[PDB]
Design an enzyme around this catalytic site. Sequence first.
Site, PDB file in Angstrom:
ATOM      1  N   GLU A  82      -6.258 -10.709  -1.354  1.00 39.47           N
ATOM      2  CA  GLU A  82      -7.081 -10.476  -0.161  1.00 39.47           C
ATOM      3  C   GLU A  82      -8.551 -10.394  -0.610  1.00 39.47           C
ATOM      4  O   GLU A  82      -9.333  -9.549  -0.197  1.00 39.47           O
ATOM      5  CB  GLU A  82      -6.702  -9.169   0.583  1.00 39.47           C
ATOM      6  CG  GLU A  82      -5.196  -9.312   0.997  1.00 39.47           C
ATOM      7  CD  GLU A  82      -4.785  -7.953   1.456  1.00 39.47           C
ATOM      8  OE1 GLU A  82      -5.502  -7.490   2.528  1.00 39.47           O
ATOM      9  OE2 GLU A  82      -3.804  -7.335   1.128  1.00 39.47           O
ATOM     10  N   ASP A 122     -12.294 -10.375  -1.404  1.00 36.08           N
ATOM     11  CA  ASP A 122     -13.595 -10.445  -0.733  1.00 36.08           C
ATOM     12  C   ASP A 122     -14.489  -9.541  -1.557  1.00 36.08           C
ATOM     13  O   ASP A 122     -13.998  -8.642  -2.291  1.00 36.08           O
ATOM     14  CB  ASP A 122     -13.561 -10.201   0.763  1.00 36.08           C
ATOM     15  CG  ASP A 122     -12.865  -8.947   1.217  1.00 36.08           C
ATOM     16  OD1 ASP A 122     -12.741  -7.980   0.409  1.00 36.08           O
ATOM     17  OD2 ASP A 122     -12.439  -8.868   2.375  1.00 36.08           O
ATOM     18  N   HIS A 178     -10.274  -6.189  -2.999  1.00 31.43           N
ATOM     19  CA  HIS A 178     -11.428  -5.890  -2.145  1.00 31.43           C
ATOM     20  C   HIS A 178     -12.485  -5.188  -2.999  1.00 31.43           C
ATOM     21  O   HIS A 178     -12.454  -3.941  -3.112  1.00 31.43           O
ATOM     22  CB  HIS A 178     -11.060  -5.017  -0.966  1.00 31.43           C
ATOM     23  CG  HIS A 178     -10.167  -5.649   0.048  1.00 31.43           C
ATOM     24  ND1 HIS A 178     -10.469  -6.788   0.753  1.00 31.43           N
ATOM     25  CD2 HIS A 178      -8.935  -5.233   0.446  1.00 31.43           C
ATOM     26  CE1 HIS A 178      -9.444  -7.059   1.569  1.00 31.43           C
ATOM     27  NE2 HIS A 178      -8.527  -6.139   1.387  1.00 31.43           N
ATOM     28  N   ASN A 209       2.250  -5.291  -3.096  1.00 24.97           N
ATOM     29  CA  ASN A 209       0.791  -5.507  -2.956  1.00 24.97           C
ATOM     30  C   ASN A 209       0.048  -4.217  -2.742  1.00 24.97           C
ATOM     31  O   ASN A 209       0.521  -3.336  -2.008  1.00 24.97           O
ATOM     32  CB  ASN A 209       0.634  -6.414  -1.733  1.00 24.97           C
ATOM     33  CG  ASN A 209      -0.736  -6.996  -1.519  1.00 24.97           C
ATOM     34  OD1 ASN A 209      -1.254  -7.717  -2.405  1.00 24.97           O
ATOM     35  ND2 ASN A 209      -1.357  -6.772  -0.363  1.00 24.97           N
ATOM     36  N   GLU A 251       0.759  -1.243   0.000  1.00 25.76           N
ATOM     37  CA  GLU A 251       0.000   0.000   0.000  1.00 25.76           C
ATOM     38  C   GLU A 251       0.791   1.295   0.000  1.00 25.76           C
ATOM     39  O   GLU A 251       0.510   2.228   0.738  1.00 25.76           O
ATOM     40  CB  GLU A 251      -0.989   0.021   1.212  1.00 25.76           C
ATOM     41  CG  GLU A 251      -1.949  -1.147   1.214  1.00 25.76           C
ATOM     42  CD  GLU A 251      -2.903  -1.209   2.383  1.00 25.76           C
ATOM     43  OE1 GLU A 251      -2.906  -0.286   3.233  1.00 25.76           O
ATOM     44  OE2 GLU A 251      -3.666  -2.228   2.469  1.00 25.76           O
TER      45      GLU A 251
HETATM   46  C1  LIG Z   1      -5.423  -6.072   3.024  1.00 30.86           C
HETATM   47  O1  LIG Z   1      -6.669  -5.778   3.636  1.00 30.86           O
HETATM   48  C2  LIG Z   1      -6.957  -6.580   4.787  1.00 30.86           C
HETATM   49  C3  LIG Z   1      -5.811  -6.385   5.811  1.00 30.86           C
HETATM   50  O2  LIG Z   1      -6.052  -7.216   6.940  1.00 30.86           O
HETATM   51  C4  LIG Z   1      -6.778  -6.540   7.979  1.00 30.86           C
HETATM   52  O3  LIG Z   1      -5.833  -5.669   8.605  1.00 30.86           O
HETATM   53  C5  LIG Z   1      -6.475  -4.888   9.646  1.00 30.86           C
HETATM   54  C6  LIG Z   1      -6.855  -5.905  10.753  1.00 30.86           C
HETATM   55  O4  LIG Z   1      -7.634  -5.203  11.766  1.00 30.86           O
HETATM   56  C7  LIG Z   1      -7.805  -6.980  10.201  1.00 30.86           C
HETATM   57  O5  LIG Z   1      -7.989  -8.032  11.182  1.00 30.86           O
HETATM   58  C8  LIG Z   1      -7.099  -7.656   8.988  1.00 30.86           C
HETATM   59  O6  LIG Z   1      -8.079  -8.508   8.346  1.00 30.86           O
HETATM   60  C9  LIG Z   1      -4.467  -6.786   5.182  1.00 30.86           C
HETATM   61  O7  LIG Z   1      -3.349  -6.605   6.037  1.00 30.86           O
HETATM   62  C10 LIG Z   1      -4.287  -5.865   3.999  1.00 30.86           C
HETATM   63  F1  LIG Z   1      -3.042  -6.089   3.382  1.00 30.86           F
END
Ligand SMILES: *[C@H]1OC[C@@H](O[C@@H]2OC[C@@H](O)[C@H](O)[C@H]2O)[C@H](O)[C@H]1F
Length: 309
Positions: A236, A238, A207, A170, A128
């Site tokens: 990831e 969903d 996402h 990513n 990110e």
């Molecule tokens: C892509 O998006 C999902 C993220 O995972 C979340 O990170 C925040 C945490 O509170 C949640 O439990 C996780 O599902 C992941 O790291 C990111 F790369």
Amino acid sequence: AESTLGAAAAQSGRYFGTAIASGRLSDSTYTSIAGREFNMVTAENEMKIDATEPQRGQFNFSSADRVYNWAVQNGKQVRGHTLAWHSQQPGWMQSLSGSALRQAMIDHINGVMAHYKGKIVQWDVVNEAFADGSSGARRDSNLQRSGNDWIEVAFRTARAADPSAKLCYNDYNVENWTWAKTQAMYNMVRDFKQRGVPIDCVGFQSHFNSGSPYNSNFRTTLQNFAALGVDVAITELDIQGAPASTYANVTNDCLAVSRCLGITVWGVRDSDSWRSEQTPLLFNNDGSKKAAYTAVLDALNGGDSSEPP
Ligand SMILES: *[C@H]1OC[C@@H](O[C@@H]2OC[C@@H](O)[C@H](O)[C@H]2O)[C@H](O)[C@H]1F
């Protein structure tokens, strides 16, 4: 044809994975479904910077190792997530800048990758780094303020630490080919490959929701990144409301792209999801298969016949 996602994916040399939470490993319904259906595991949170290095140079792999061990004892491979990211930094790292931060970033990469040397098929090395919106600019973070070269340095550090792992960049909101963010990521990866920066793969978080809907041009995105000489992965996945149509379209986009390694959905049941209110996964709260499960499995099998081969 195969009756479970990971086995169906493996027919085309691919994987079908999930995100595992260490705290859910005592839930037998969870582990029964996850163990049966997936051949790749990402730790949901246990391999992030805050979890693995809560104090500077005081690594902690207890929860990370519980996930790794469960995965390999159950025949799954593991994607490491994630080594350098603006989010989920421990407080001591958030307070660092410049050269101090740069050394702490390199030290964090080295300590985590050394623990898992030779054990991880793909690492999300950097996550990110692009800003949201249409600028195509780097996100403002302490890491970006330490120098624009931080991403390249993270990849070079990672390659040296474990040359057996595929090293991925990513990001999210980079799936639709027309978006500026997508193009900024494309220009960076293209530059890296041109110059010999060690990067092997690009991860598309996937996402999809009403704010960032799926578009059929995701296949164009995957093809164009693969053509730069990197593998692509859906990391990831969903989808808000878990429409079976869109889940199957995403699956078929990966199956259409030779360098698409596999798909990871971001959790097991809807109740396990980080966005459970959007009911975005393949299994209901009670563990039953949703309509989306069937469409994904059928896509992976190229159909649903029930007859002699
Ligand atoms: C892509 O998006 C999902 C993220 O995972 C979340 O990170 C925040 C945490 O509170 C949640 O439990 C996780 O599902 C992941 O790291 C990111 F790369």
